[PDB]
Design a binder for this molecule. Sequence first.
Ligand code: SF4
Ligand code: SF4
Lengths: 71, 71
Amino acid sequence: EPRAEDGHAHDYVNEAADASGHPRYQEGQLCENCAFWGEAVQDGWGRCTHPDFDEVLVKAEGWCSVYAPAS
Amino acid sequence: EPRAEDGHAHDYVNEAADASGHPRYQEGQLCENCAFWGEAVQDGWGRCTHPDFDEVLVKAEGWCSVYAPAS
Ligand code: SF4
Ligand code: SF4
């Protein structure tokens, strides 16, 4: 699938540091340690199970406002 | 806490101007200059001491029909 573009859904960012001034954002929060992290695919990219990112590839070091701590 | 969406309570808008249609609205009126404002908790977002806004965060440039001027 095509790689996700900043702002895709929920304020998505390919560079979590970029989500900085977001009230919900916390240091340490990445698509990688997210409860929506499907599996890795190619060169930092992976799949997000959250229904909203079903047709794009997302980035390991990225972030979105729908972020939940992995269990 | 979570950010407050538009219409949360008392005609709430995260962007003051949007309320230009309210009888109680006046240019220059903002959460940050409101008596119920409990200051920025996060960057551009603060607390509201009004019980109807107690679970959420409100926005410095927002406005609610229960606005009260402050010093
Ligand atoms: S839900 Fe989690 S994994 Fe999916 S894009 Fe947002 S932060 Fe990344
Ligand atoms: S009462 Fe309304 S205008 Fe005043 S701070 Fe709370 S949300 Fe903003």
